[PDB]
Design a protein around this ligand. Sequence first.
Ligand SMILES: N#Cc1cccc(S(=O)(=O)NC2CC2)c1
Ligand SMILES: [Cl-]
Ligand code: NA
Length: 371
Amino acid sequence: KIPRGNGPYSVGCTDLMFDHTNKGTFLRLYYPSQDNDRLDTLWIPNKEYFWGLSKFLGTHWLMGNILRLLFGSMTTPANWNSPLRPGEKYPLVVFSHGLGAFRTLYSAIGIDLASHGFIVAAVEHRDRSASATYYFKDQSAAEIGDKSWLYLRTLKQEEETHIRNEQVRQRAKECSQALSLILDIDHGKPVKNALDLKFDMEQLKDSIDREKIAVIGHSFGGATVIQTLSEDQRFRCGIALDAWMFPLGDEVYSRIPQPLFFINSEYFQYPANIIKMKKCYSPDKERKMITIRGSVHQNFADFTFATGKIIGHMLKLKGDIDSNVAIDLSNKASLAFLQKHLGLHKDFDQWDCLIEGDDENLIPGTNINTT
Ligand SMILES: N#Cc1cccc(S(=O)(=O)NC2CC2)c1
Ligand SMILES: [Cl-]
Ligand code: NA
């Protein structure tokens, strides 16, 4: 089980695709909800995501069918299409997924943020970094629900530097585009969701605290945070969860005026990556770094909750640390950081000590030596 949020708000979830094309925005929305008696949200909602995962693993497509058998009925505890909780303006997080992931695999984070009064837009990237994603070729296809699928692109070593940079820039553009869509819906623009879902987008009108925007992401999504900040000053701070820094161009490092928080796992990181993070530092800039003790790269994503303890540790989905404990730390520390740099008037400053890595399961800064 993916944990419920630790906050006071019930959580809703829905999907938005606008426009319907491969250049449109696709996101999964997590939001504070009015009601708590809805069906839970299907975690991986189409068979094609499993085929995507199987290609990402480098196995036959029939491993995909087996994955679907194992995980295809699994839910996450958000009230599917529940009405938005009215009467309050919510700050906004745009969330970016990692390589081979897609929009639905960070519900533990999105749910928990939502439970504390954030609206969270988990984008699905169309850069071929997702295991799978979909869209519609034209208006006819969207009407009848004739999905076209786009699968993970595998790269030759000769393509890595160039194509990973092209992708992170596209990812950044997709984050900015997703922000603009949400802000336009906030400002009342009719938007016909290309997915025929019983969640009226007009609910979001006047529901966003329009200056309180952050960008968060994991792995490739952590590089995406940084690229995004460098090109869209509407994002007021960023949180990079175990960032994979390789995609970033040399130019971005000096170009991030906003506060930025690195939350790392103990076992993922390596000197080349850490050196790149430290290139983001300068005395005028607000930078924080913590490392979760006994954690692995997958502690930030939902598959850390999908299998047992034993098989979890074998597959590197789990680390030495308990998964709920690790994500509570990442999420609470994130909450404190967001409150500080978005100027929120909540109680998230109770976790200020976690930003400085003051906790028995935190290492201040990094365990990685870079000499
Ligand atoms: N859950 C989950 C999940 C599924 C697929 C890929 C990811 S990743 O961490 O973005 N990709 C990194 C490992 C290379 C996470
Ligand atoms: Cl329902
Ligand atoms: Na921009």
